[PDB]
């Protein structure tokens, strides 16, 4: 058997990216061998979270009684080479016919990133095949006419950008540097930032697209000569680590660093030697949501051909996996449950049985998905008309001397003061 | 465009407190500090403090700590300054003023937008309407006037012929004597246009709800 | 606290000429690669207007005849050429350090050719008399420079008590000053005297300008 | 031209040994795609001209018939995906098989001509790039596609907008304007246009007072009022309008109502749009300076088309991207006579010919025969290998594609003349060099002198 696939009465696609590789030129039309590339522990954790969720539901005699959920899951280290997995989810018996109005899957969870979603979503949108993303935060996916069957269980970039602005406005500094990943996620972030501060005291004094060619020596030289103290770094794990590691090596000091939620809970950087030297790190963070039972599931899982379904991660420390950045955990959990509930309601399941042999079209799943209204771990799972989530909080953290991301504030989407911060918890310099 | 609109002049009792409003419009209110400035009649400008309308944080100049209280109302985009325990040394013109964009800190920001100013008169003296007296007299130009006597508090306004007579007008600054103000105003018209064309001064004193139209009638 | 000292305190400059105004700070007002000294114009009864920020940056909408220079502790505002509506008080302001402080200000006057006052005298109105008071008013209008001397004579003897004076701000058209002199008496005292004189002395003439009326006419 | 005799009546489906996919915005919305796009229809006709001419050339692909299938894109994401998927079906099955390795997979089409718009390229460019299927756009100008790491199989016969915005900023600098606004349509083209322009404009010391985006899906009129209010507020007298046509029309509908006048800088998307220039009192908005692709005129296009529409009308009593095209007659020859089609037809023509020559090279042809038979298997990735950095003469044009899939094509700078309802030529932009002649300019101002 395999972690990546599970037979069931109905199938859910899982689109993950367990390995990382930078894009490169290719001269053949074929999938990429991701199993040989850089392993990513927290993405792998999120992958397990989906496996955990499905098994939890299959264990339940209440949700989907006597109806098993299976999955086909993928490790797409490359968005441009992800299409074989995507085709498999949409095919009738390993065949696609383009002009069709019984697909292998009833919906899909993922993908994690905006680049992955932009590359493949039109193929799902055409037949209103439902996608529930646990990570994609692009502004553009809130345009329902462009992405009619796209939903997500994390907030749009606009909300995180608002929280970041609230962090800046709580303090006295008004010149800001904005370092962003040279990708769709990063560019959209810069755009929202620029839009949000235009009518405020905040001045964007410097900004730069981050990639492998960044002259960090020169970037930090300029930042220093403009006497800029606040540096927003809006970037995924790989880019954020490049920035902060370069900052340590170039003896950047006395800065105030502000992280987006994709690296405020990073687990490598708070323990890196010298991290202290570059100043103070704050960030917007997803609060830690405890998923009961997950710990036991991981211990159990670690104790254990189609492309992009191979982990090559034998002999992982169970400890390291448990302790990995837990951001996006509830987004994954809630995404699986939303599809489960949608299926349950589409089948017209009662409290202890389901009408059987019923053929389900993905578009029927969609209608129930958009009408989602259920409780999960004392949160209420709903989506607005744009497919954006109406659940999930944002907090402010401070990386404190023992290496923890200590909560020091809460971001309120509605409140008169949008951002509270207990400033005495923050130990500067 | 940006407008800072302050509440009107106010006569207030010694020992009392009063609240000045600054209604901000035309921009995103919580994006900029709102400053307050005091100008005594001596004319020195003095920075009182500022408020961050986003979270309510305040910074004061030391001497105004416990003397002025800055607040904001985000739902009406209004900044407030409350002055406590008023004495005659709190008599002054008070301005709100928004920080601009481009300074590196909240502390270094300069003031790009100003409210029109609020005159605060701290006195136990009571509100009194003015008496308005005509001032009538062969040069080609003849000068006339209006004496505006015994009012309190400031201000009064003086126009001539409802605004139509504007050139050759001098409206002198009030003078306070025994808790009462007096000012006068002169207007100069061609000698051939008076008395044949009626010249009338219009005086108003809002504080006592007074409006007087005094025609300048030949002796 | 940073103390800002402006010089000169007051200044008279002809139309078309250059006005130079200094501001000195007790301590440096530099930081972040900038000098945080700003210049404001204030006309009487109006809010201050920001002319120049960070020593030399001319604000949008402000005429180019205004310019600023300097660094650390020494700054200069230059107005060139001066125009007729430029009379005002000019303030510097440092924002490098809490608390923000302003200079005591420099009053710029428009210099023009000397002009003698037009004097007009007015008896009390009957409307005032019948309530029990008697104010005698004298206007001294459209003169330059501002220095002027006014004496009141009642029946030949100079009267010093009861006289309030008041100057207008400079006129924005012809750059002159005007003044009102008001001798306030009681009706009983007014009716006890005949000749009322307002006498004005100004550098434009060695002979004073005298205006009189007699009460019994 | 004797070979005009042998041409067939099928517009959107020509049979052949080797086939091209066609993607054209033929019918759009006003989900229902019911509004004929006459420019889109016109460009499709240019491809049929190209292909009929290629097959009548005895020595270009001598033993091989070139065919194609053209589909409507409706400039809409859900619509274009299906024909793009159909291009990828296995040639002898009609189905798209699911595999990890497509190296030996023979697709129905060998290359794609189109789509027209940059927003549509973003829909299918990664899909087609995965298969390494050559796609040659005759109209999508966004600079996003200049990266072969992101868009692996993309080419175009029109230049990237990063060059056009360089031309615009240079022109603005020449006329000594330093204070402008920029307005785009709210999709890939206008959005990248506005950003690229703002970047360049900053670098060259042009202050952009205001940036605006015109919605393409909403009611655009509220956003337009806001944009126009900001233009009046900033008092800019030069506005760069980097926009698709329908948003542009809606925009100038409001510019006209509010009697605004100034300088308007037209991107190539609307610079010769009759939809704009036929608006009531458009002649009152002042001076329009525009940029368009430098192209040859296809002298045989109008003579090819009249003959075709005669043959269509003849066999006219005998599923479609243009249902109502059955009743096309010689009267409808105006579709290719239209100036927006005449001046851009070559971009479509060069794209088809670029593939035809590449195929000629792939198959090792000479003037007489090709290494080709009914059992020859054509893989798009092999054709891609040939197309990289391709140099080919097409009519009198020496066409070279750089590493990025961009052509050595420049711009014509033009002005709209109101009394004429024509366009004057005021200069050109080639390589990175703007060459205009200021005295050739007409200024539509109170005294016919240049603003500022
Ligand atoms: C697993 O990964 C390493 C590279 O990190 C590679 O060298 C090894 O061959 C891989 N094992 C596989 C693909 O079975
Ligand atoms: C589901 O049930 C099995 C027992 O049949 C148990 O081992 C497993 O831990 C459960 N998995 C969950 C709750 O995710
Ligand atoms: C559960 O489903 C099976 C088929 O997998 C069916 O045969 C059986 O009747 C069901 N059992 C129930 C509803 O208890
Ligand atoms: C790092 O230290 C070096 C030498 O001590 C210095 O030249 C440089 O400015 C520092 N880099 C910073 C502060 O970014
Ligand atoms: C969601 O469900 C709860 C009860 O299940 C109900 O109180 C609430 O009104 C529902 N929200 C809807 C129907 O929008
Ligand atoms: C850092 O934060 C963690 C969790 O918020 C807390 O338990 C720990 O005591 C903190 N360490 C400090 C404040 O030194
Ligand atoms: C704020 O921070 C201080 C310093 O750590 C802490 O002791 C206190 O409990 C906090 N105040 C709250 C949570 O109200
Ligand atoms: C083309 O048409 C001519 C007459 O119109 C005919 O004689 C000839 O057979 C055709 N040539 C072909 C089909 O190659
Ligand atoms: C893909 O297929 C081609 C031809 O069958 C082969 O040359 C190539 O090695 C394959 N790549 C694989 C199997 O990874
Ligand atoms: C535009 O012009 C017309 C006259 O041609 C006028 O009636 C109308 O009020 C104007 N509209 C404006 C200024 O918005
Ligand atoms: C063709 O021409 C006729 C009139 O000449 C017109 O009615 C018809 O709409 C045209 N077809 C088009 C423009 O597609
Ligand atoms: C195109 O024409 C040029 C100029 O004559 C020539 O040098 C070049 O070799 C030609 N390229 C071809 C035929 O591919
Ligand atoms: C108008 O007419 C012709 C062609 O329409 C053109 O050559 C001429 O330059 C135009 N007149 C102008 C631009 O003044
Ligand atoms: C520019 O056009 C003018 C037209 O009057 C003429 O003086 C000159 O020949 C032209 N210069 C060029 C094309 O370089
Ligand atoms: N890297 C991250 O922060 C997660 C993905 C990111 N939110 C995106 O949309 O691309
Ligand atoms: N319809 C059009 O001609 C649009 C073309 C435009 N250059 C684009 O890239 O989208
Ligand atoms: Ca007496
Ligand atoms: Cl298109
Ligand atoms: Na179940």
Author numbering:
A (entry chain A): 25 to 125, 130 to 332, 342 to 466
B (entry chain H): 1 to 137, 143 to 224
C (entry chain L): 1 to 217
D (entry chain B): 21 to 50, 63 to 350, 357 to 490
Quote the passages of the study that discuss this structure, keeping the authors' original sentences.
We found that a variety of L-amino acids, such as glutamine, alanine, arginine, glycine, and glutamate, but not D-glutamine, induced FRET signal elevation of fluorescence-labelled LBDs, which we had previously found to correlate with LBD ligand binding. Some of them, such as glutamine, alanine, and arginine, also induced responses in the full-length receptor according to Ca2+-imaging. In the crystal structures, these various L-amino acids are bound to T1r2aLBD in the cleft between LB1 and LB2. The α-amino and carboxyl groups and the Cα and Cβ atoms of the amino acid ligands are located at almost the same positions in the binding site in T1r2a, and form hydrogen bonds with the protein, including to the main-chain amide and side-chain hydroxyl groups of Ser142 and Ser165, and the main chain carbonyl group of Gly163, all residues in LB1. In contrast, the α-substituent groups of the bound amino acids, such as the 2-carbamoylethyl group in L-glutamine, have no direct hydrogen bonds with the receptor. However, numerous water molecules surround these substituent groups, and the ligands are thus in hydrated states. Indirect, water-mediated hydrogen bonds are apparent, such as with the carbonyl group of Ala263 or the carboxyl group of Asp288 and Asp289, in the LB2 region. Notably, higher affinity ligands, such as L-glutamine and alanine, are surrounded by more ordered water molecules, implying that the binding site recognizes the ligand together with the structured water in the hydration shell. The space that accommodates the ligand is much larger than any of the ligands, and there is no evidence of significant induced fit on binding, which allows accommodation of ligand plus hydration shell. The ligand-binding space is not completely occluded from the solvent, existing as a ‘back room' with ∼7 Å height and ∼16 Å depth, restricted by Ile64, Pro66, and Lys265 at∼ 8 Å distance from the carbamoyl group of the bound glutamine.
